[PDB]
From a paper:
In this structure, [name] fits into the groove formed between two adjacent [name] helices in antiparallel manner, resulting in a 6-HB structural mimic as tightly assembled as that of the viral trimer [name]-HR2 complex in post-fusion state. [name] binds to [name]-trimer mainly through hydrophobic forces, including two flexible loop areas and a middle α-helix. Compared with the 6-HB structure of [name]-[name]-2, [name] showed enhanced interactions in several local regions. For example, the V1177, V1176, and A1174 residues in the [name]-[name]-2 HR2 motif bind to [name] through moderate hydrophobic forces, which are enhanced by replacement with larger hydrophobic residues L10, F9, and V7 of [name] at the corresponding sites, respectively. Y30 on [name] can bind to backbone nitrogen atoms of G932, and also the side chain of Q935 on [name] together with E27 on [name], while the E21 residue on [name] could bind to both K25 and K18 residues through strong salt bridges. Such enhancement most likely improves the overall stability of 6-HB formed by [name] and [name], thus increasing the efficiency of [name] in blocking binding of the viral HR2 motif to [name]. However, in [name]-[name]-2, K18 of [name] turns back to bind E21 on [name] to form a new salt bridge to stabilize [name]. Therefore, through the variable conformations of hydrophilic residues, [name] peptides could adapt to multiple residue differences in the [name] motif of HCoVs, thereby maintaining high affinity to [name] and high inhibitory activity against different HCoVs.
The first involves insertion of the fusion peptide into cellular membrane, followed by [name]-trimer formation by trimeric heptad repeat 1 ([name]), which expose three hydrophobic grooves on their surface that then interact with the trimeric heptad repeat 2 (HR2) domains to form a six-helix bundle (6-HB). Previously, we have reported that OC43-HR2-derived peptide, [name], and its lipopeptide, EK1C4, as pan-[name] fusion inhibitors, target the [name] regions of S proteins of multiple HCoVs and effectively inhibit their infection.
Author numbering:
A (entry chain C): 911 to 969, 1004 to 1035
B (entry chain A): 912 to 969, 1002 to 1036
C (entry chain B): 911 to 969, 1002 to 1035
Write the structure that this text describes.
Amino acid sequence: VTQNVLYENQKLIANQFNSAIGKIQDSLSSTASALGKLQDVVNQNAQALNTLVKQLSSNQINVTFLDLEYEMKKLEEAIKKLEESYIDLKE
Amino acid sequence: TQNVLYENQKLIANQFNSAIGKIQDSLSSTASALGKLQDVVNQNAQALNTLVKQLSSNLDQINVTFLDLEYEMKKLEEAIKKLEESYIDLKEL
Amino acid sequence: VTQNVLYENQKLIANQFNSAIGKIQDSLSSTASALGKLQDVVNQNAQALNTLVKQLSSNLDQINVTFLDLEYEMKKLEEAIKKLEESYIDLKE
């Protein structure tokens, strides 16, 4: 019920929130990196399968490719946007 | 001071809401990426299986596996929905 | 506008923040699980393709199959869950 107690709790709240921001940023960066690796490998093996198909026909099957660039960029943008969610209290 | 404490409380709420929105967006794009991954991986598993089948009717130990991420994608959508309940509306203060 | 309302709002804010942190930890858990499932299926279909290429080459030098290792990213997601555990707010009397 004291102004001092309220002020201390407020600083605690802001500091814990700010601490969470950095951790969530790292998790977003690791998720984007994992998606990039997945795209690389899936497309490489799709290309191997396609090459195998046509090299076997040199002597019906639809291979598909993956594009996750937009989602990965949205994750990077979230990282930069969260940079702007930090709390800077007055006083 | 009472004034400044209240302004800080509202700043805290606004920053928190903006972070929640950005995190919801990130979760949406992760679920969308996961769905695309499932579609493409299963389509190429089908292609490999069809190649095996057409090769054996012209070995039977080649095992193709398929992916089901739909429980995880639904959990990401649920997280979005639940974070929607964590918003603090200024009228709540 | 009144210190008692400020105190109540402070408790409301802290509880919504803690609940959001829990939801975010859950989303990270389900993302790590989806990533592990993806690695399993992608590598199993890679090995299936490689086995097919070898059995046809013993029946193709240019065909390269690659494998996926997401272990660093998955450990970093588990790490984010663990660190976020230290971000909870314990207000007191």
